[PDB]
Symmetry: D2
Subunit: 369 residues, 4 copies
């Protein structure tokens, strides 16, 4: 029986672990945290990611208790400039813990071995995984799914571009307050941009009837706009119509201002070691394909290993087949983010939705635009 060691219990690792376990691999997953959790309040998935969940036998638990807005709306200075529905392309908004719980339960149900407080600090391409405790594990496959600061990656050395954005945002979950919001289209996704009187933006994303996901974006050199817990006045000033929710947000002390880190590698594989997710391809958040591409790539990895070839050859086949979708998506996402292209609305072009349109299960592009 083939043995897999997965480093990282985020979406990438849990996806890889479940996918491999379903193919009869024996699999242990290492999470360095004392407990399995997800961070970042909310998340969008699209058709591509939802297809992975389906292939993971975890779709049902994700749809139940999540939400598809009637429309994806963009505002500039409180003026609606676009409403997009993507010609029926499936998409979904949920809390990070909602998507995460579904993945964990599915992994435990298949009998994936999960070690918490277990941190990968080095990996050898001949299939050896070194933990912080000193323990050394032999395996036929080693998946580095350990985030943007991947120690699996850096222990081996991968030529790479790695940098951090100037600005970031505060992501949080607050009650919907839908009756308090009064008249309007409050089940929509609404990207509310402003450049006057200053640069402040909210991405309003309903997760379900109870929970609203908010991304509060202001420049890092805005001492008030970037404060956590949120400086209520400067947010209520530019978003009066979101006051009830902003009030609940001011109450939260777990709130943080996060900047965005990206990584581009020349290669995602070295012998028996594969890098998936942010370890290999962290990107600007603009197209909300960060975890989708991670899940697709993780899922596609288990597929390429069902071909009868050596683990080394499958991995090279894997990357060659799957990476260009992620490359174009990261490039376009970076371009959008640095140009603030989303603020114009109607940005979800056919090209922008390429990653979203990919079906990992049948390996084709679906939902044409």
């Amino acid at each position: 029986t083939r043995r897999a060691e997965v480093a990282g219990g985020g979406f990438a690792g849990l996806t890889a672990a479940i996918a491999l376990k379903q193919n009869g691999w024996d699999v242990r997953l290492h999470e360095k945290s004392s407990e399995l959790r997800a961070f970042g309040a909310g998340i969008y998935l699209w058709h591509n990611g939802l297809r992975v969940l389906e292939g993971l036998g975890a779709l049902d638990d994700v749809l139940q208790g999540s939400h598809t807005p009637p429309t994806y709306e963009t505002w500039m200075h409180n003026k609606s400039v676009s409403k997009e529905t993507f010609n029926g392309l499936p998409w979904r908004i949920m809390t990070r813990s909602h998507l995460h719980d579904a993945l964990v339960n599915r992994a435990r149900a298949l009998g994936v071995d999960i070690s918490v407080n277990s941190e990968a600090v080095a990996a050898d391409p001949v299939g050896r995984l070194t933990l912080q405790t000193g323990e050394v594990l032999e395996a036929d496959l080693i998946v580095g799914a350990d985030g943007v600061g991947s120690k699996v990656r850096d222990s081996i050395g991968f030529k790479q571009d790695r940098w951090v954005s100037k600005d970031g945002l505060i992501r949080l979950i607050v009650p919907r307050m839908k009756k308090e919001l009064g008249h309007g289209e409050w089940d929509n996704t609404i990207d509310m941009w402003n450049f006057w009187p200053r640069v402040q933006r909210i991405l309003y994303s309903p997760c379900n009837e109870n929970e609203l996901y908010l991304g509060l974006m202001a420049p890092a050199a805005d001492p008030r706009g970037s404060s956590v817990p949120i400086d209520l006045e400067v947010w209520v000033e530019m978003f009066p119509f979101l006051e009830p929710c902003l009030i609940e947000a001011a109450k939260l002390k777990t709130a943080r201002y996060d900047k965005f880190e990206t990584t581009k590698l020349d290669s995602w594989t070295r012998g028996k070691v594969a890098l998936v997710g942010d370890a290999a391809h962290a990107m600007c958040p603009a197209l909300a394909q960060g975890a989708g591409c991670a899940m697709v790539n993780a899922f596609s990895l288990s597929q390429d290993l069902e071909e009868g070839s050596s683990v080394e050859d499958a991995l090279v086949a894997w990357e060659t087949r799957i990476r260009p979708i992620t490359d174009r998506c990261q490039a376009l996402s970076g371009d959008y983010a640095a140009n603030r292209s989303l603020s114009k609305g109607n940005m979800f072009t056919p090209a922008a939705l390429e990653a979203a349109r990919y079906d990992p299960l049948r390996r084709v592009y679906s939902w044409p635009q």
Copy 2:
């Protein structure tokens, strides 16, 4: 190697033929008419039907050149009373010929044997099918997919319950005429109801950028409102905003008329004989689930034939499994037609969508409401 005779080349018949063929059946399809064609109208499919198409390998041909409206809108006396998007549950509008062509080509590529000009007139519960020429064809399974006037079930004697509505409607296709329509949300499904000055309803359905599907509903007891070619005046009178399109519609010397009609049977199976589509369960078009349930039931038929039983025991287990869903859908659809409930808007409740939520491939309900 099991052998199957399928009577009628409609959606239910083609679905049945392809599904069996994919499972290794030798299948032959008899089409009464001189060729394979559809009524020249539009049609709605939902998640349940789309999943069947995925299961038959015909999803991609369909999605290409079809449209998901941004919303499903209901009007009452030109006042918007409802916008619905079904919490993300997939759906689609397309011409009937579009759906047909995809099923036909998939049927052909797989090597189904399609006999045109060939009319089934009788079937035996021991496994025989009689054509209009009196010729007797043997097989291990006979599929009555011959529509509402099904000779195959009439030849055997099935106790039908029948029910007819006061309403009928005209289904046709015209150019989108989108500029001439001027200002509005003309990519929507708009269900335009009126009770004053008289009962007249137009279902407005965009199929793609070139073709608009119109459903013109009126009491059958209305000489003008049910007239094909269409009585241009009575329609423009109550729907002035659709004038350009209606002008192209009174130009059609031939167009499909139907009186709403719902038939429920004591059973669907007699020995080696199975009834699918309108033959088994024709319903009132309120919930746009006729072809949907047909396809689900035709596809589900080949599923139960795989579990290693006699064709007879399988057909019984089939109906026992898949039927209640069709029954509940037919009942609710007929109730809506009678009380004209769709004029109220917001009528696609969780109960109304139970059919559409059902996933035939995995045999669960998805897309919770």
Copy 3:
């Protein structure tokens, strides 16, 4: 010093009394009832009537505590079909008691002699007025301003044309209830028409921040729709959006009902006798010009009495001058009532507003359309 007896303390009577008084007439006013009061409804005045009020020195008391709606809106089956603002032509809504109180106080300040509990029963074309007590009062001018059942003209015998509508309506006042009404443009005049399920119309008229004037129209042949106190169900059924206000309206054990009624006379003058207001020209309330034409005609009466003629020659020159305007307005108003034309919206055409455009002070038409 000429001397005048005016019968009836309505708008036409008060206008007449004040106008003559300002010109040096000694004037006495007889009010049948125990005191001076108005029906407890609302009322529309236009430029023509406002100019009369300016001419009587009573404009300012009126404008204070009255409202000009931002627009005059027409609905059909809850669909907005019309917004009108009359190219700036002035207009106003106010309670009837508001208009009354201003005229009364102006009448008093000028020293008009107001006799209450005093009922005119007959008048002589030689200059005599008979009270219910049989007492005969002499004067140089008698003014029949005693309303629709005018004893003063009946005593003399005027050939009337009469005409009655199938419709009547309930006029009442309730609190504005503006928060409870929620989202909308609730300072508008909204004329809410319905023909389905049955003919029911509500004229929605804000008078000021505290008081809302409602006109509930229904066929007189409708037992429920014409019932005062109001049949709460039938109204909330067709007007759910006005529920809070209607709740306060079914709380009124007494409220003004009127069947539409239009009377045209062979003439308005007999010798020294002049007829004004409903006495002379009661009309269908479609164009809200009854009190308007009354006041214009009462005010115009004192104008012709100044040009140095016999009271008899003056009264003749008066009608010859001012009457056609009232005739055209009465005809068009009656036509609108009969055909229920106001349901179509945009019905305040140039012709429909000829009355309102007329300026009594300068004797020209203003505010062209």
Copy 4:
């Protein structure tokens, strides 16, 4: 017979001349231009100014061929932030030449003597007017109505604040293009403000069915925004929806960028000399009361001279009675303009409309807010 010499044939002088002539003054008006014309494309008048026209016997010719928008709307970054109707307060938009022609025709009809190419260069308080030609005129009254650079004022010496604004605007008349503008509320007044991506603003004011008045405002140090003829690209960029009209505006070569000059004086009178209009009180354009206050003041001057006192004493009475309305209005207007207070909408407060509410004919405040 009293003789008046009026310097200046703008709205102030023509108003004074007509008013005085109507009171039996003999009056000559001096206009330094070779021909009588008005400049500045369009103009707003309100109730106060319309009341003066009424008192001048020139109201009728102004209403005919002018326009009252349904509403006064304000936009910020294409988002409607206010719609104001001023509780029925009359107001009107017209071309400058429309208001001017009415005044000229009325002045000629009364027999006002009009000398063109006649420029006042000095005035003596004992009633002497010196022209550029050398001619010296004796009179009982001398009205300085000669604009912001009043030579009547400066020949005598009046302590004063006089300055020029930093920015200005381009005012022009173009065809309505109402069909080309497509869907919207294109009979409204719309003040369209923007500060991002740059400071550009259009005041959109319909004058009648044929003529639209546009004020294109950009800073003086914007080389493109301030160009005449207009730089079409930078205007179409921020106002795409006004393209058809902007195209017609680019065509005009008479277009100029004008800055705003103001004057505040300690006194408006010296002996027999009175200053009216911009000569005495030019103000920031924000409240559109520039010509209204001029007309009110001019008209009020003829009133104070019908009191039987000396011309010197009437003039002191005149200013004392009438000036504070103009003072508060100019101060508020200046405050608004420098603060760009109009951009917030809902700025036409009761206080802002004080000047507008004044009725010069009855000397009271009307149309309460």
